[PDB]
DNA sequence: CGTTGCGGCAAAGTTATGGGTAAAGTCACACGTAGTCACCATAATGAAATAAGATCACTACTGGGCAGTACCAGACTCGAACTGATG
C-alpha cells in the first residue's frame, strides 16, 4: 500500500535467545554512533540579524552509557 | 398489659470529587518545511505629439520729398571819369 519505508514501523524485532556480543557495548568507547540532524530552530545572525536558517547538529554517542561524547 | 405500626436519632452505607503515586502506554528520533504564482496601483521615463508660434514670400494701398527752376529787387564794391587845392 505505502511502501517499504512505511512498513518499517511494522518490522519484526530481533530477540536474543543466546547471548552474542552485546548490542550497545561491553565497555565505554567500544561501540560509538555518529549521526547528523538539523535542529528545529531558526537561527539569527550575530551581526546583521537576518534569518540564517536551521543549523545542523552532529552527535557522537557512546552506545554503552548512551553518553554524548 | 401486650402487641403492632409509626416516627425520631445517629451511625453506616453509597456516590462523588479533587489529590498523590507507581506503572502501563504513547509516540518521535529516524535530512528536511517554507515556497511560488497572481494581483492591480503608482512612479517614471522615453517617445509621440502638440498647438501655437515664427518666418518667408507675394499683393495691394497709400503717404509723400528732392534736384532743379525762377524772379524781384536791395546793397556793397569799384572802373572810369570829373573836378578842386597845391607846391
Ligand atoms: Mg540525520
Ligand atoms: Mg526532524
From TrEMBL:
Q: So which domain of life are we looking at?
A: Bacteria
Q: Which residues of the full protein are shown?
A: 485 to 553 of 898
Q: What is this protein called?
A: Integrase
Query: Can you tell me which residues bind Mg(2+) 2?
Result: 36
Amino acid at each position: 500500500r505505502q511502501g517499504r519505508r512505511a512498513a518499517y514501523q511494522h518490522e519484526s524485532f530481533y530477540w536474543e535467545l543466546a547471548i552474542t556480543t552485546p548490542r550497545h557495548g561491553d565497555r565505554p568507547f567500544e561501540i560509538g554512533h555518529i549521526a547528523h540532524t538539523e535542529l528545529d530552530v531558526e537561527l539569527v545572525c550575530s551581526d546583521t540579524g537576518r534569518n540564517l536558517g536551521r543549523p545542523w547538529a552532529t552527535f557522537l554517542v557512546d552506545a554503552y552509557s548512551r553518553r554524548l561524547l
